[PDB]
């Protein structure tokens, strides 16, 4: 949806 | 200096100030570098830059800090939505403490701005930001703000009670609960003198908020007009 993609990107990687 | 232990573990989690403020200083001046004299940015366009980049480095702090990486991806991206431009204005405002002199602004890049010109060449708006920002900064001088304080209120402000629909919300109380306490006893510990330190740190977080919010603000003015350097992640926390 409308969330950050950048922002989750970085707190999805390990 | 009389640290209790669990403000030993947030500053462990503390990246290198000088180091973080060159990093970003040679990444905008290659950017520049590259660019031609027909696409070079504007000032403006410079200070976004670099306001995503300290973004990128604040995220990444975030992200490795004890408490905060035990949250699950969801939880993470609620607290930091809701607290992004508190955590850029108390970074702004703490480094103004450590490395700025009265009368001008020290920028991330540790490139300096004398006040005169941004009260002549700038709009009412931003001079009624730099002004609220002014006073902050003028406060956590006079009371000698530290860095085992400022990252006490780092993480106030990252767990803010704020934020709904948490799946960990206990965290969050208990950030508060324990970071409060330690806040205290450090203060009462180490400046004695200042009877009054951790009350009076406090009364800062709502102005950090609502100097934040009209930063927003700002800046959302000067989105619509598509102004802001884009396909960051500046732009994505102001768009949401
Ligand atoms: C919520 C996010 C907060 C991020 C905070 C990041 C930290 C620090 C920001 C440092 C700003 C110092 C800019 C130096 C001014 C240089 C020349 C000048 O006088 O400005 C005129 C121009 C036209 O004036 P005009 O009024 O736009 O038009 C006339 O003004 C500019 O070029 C201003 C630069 C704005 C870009 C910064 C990115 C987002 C804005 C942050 C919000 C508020 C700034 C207050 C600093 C604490």
Redesign the pocket.
Same mark, same amino acid.
């Given at each position: 949806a409308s969330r950050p993609a950048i922002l989750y990107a970085l707190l999805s990687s390990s | 200096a009389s640290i209790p232990h669990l403000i030993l573990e947030l500053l462990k989690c503390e990246p290198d100030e000088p180091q973080v403020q060159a990093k970003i200083m040679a990444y905008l001046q290659q950017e520049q570098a590259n660019r031609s004299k027909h696409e070079k940015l504007?000032?403006?366009g410079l200070?976004?830059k670099? %306001?995503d980049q300290?973004l990128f480095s604040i995220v990444e702090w975030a992200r490795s800090s004890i408490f905060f990486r035990e949250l699950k991806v969801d939880d993470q991206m609620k607290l930091l939505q809701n607290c992004?431009?508190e955590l850029? $204005?108390l970074?702004?405002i703490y480094r103004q403490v450590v490395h700025g002199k009265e009368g001008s602004?020290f920028? +991330?890049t540790g490139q300096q701005?004398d006040y005169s $010109?941004?009260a002549s060449? %700038?709009?009412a708006?931003?001079?009624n930001?730099?002004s609220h920002?002014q006073e902050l900064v003028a406060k956590l001088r006079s009371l000698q703000f530290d860095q085992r304080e400022f990252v006490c209120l780092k993480f106030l402000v990252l767990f803010s009670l704020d934020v709904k629909n948490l799946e960990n919300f206990q965290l969050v109380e208990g950030v508060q609960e324990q970071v409060n306490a330690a806040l205290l006893d450090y203060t009462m510990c180490n400046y004695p003198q200042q009877t009054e330190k951790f009350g009076q740190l406090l009364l800062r977080l709502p102005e950090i908020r609502a100097?934040?919010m009209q930063?927003?603000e700002?800046?959302y003015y000067?989105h619509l007009n598509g102004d +802001?350097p884009y396909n960051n992640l500046?732009i994505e926390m102001?768009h949401a």
């Open positions: - | 504007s000032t403006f200070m976004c670099m %306001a300290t992004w431009s850029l $204005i970074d702004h602004i920028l +991330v701005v $010109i941004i060449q %700038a709009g708006t931003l001079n930001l730099m920002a100097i934040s930063a927003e700002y800046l000067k +802001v500046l102001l």
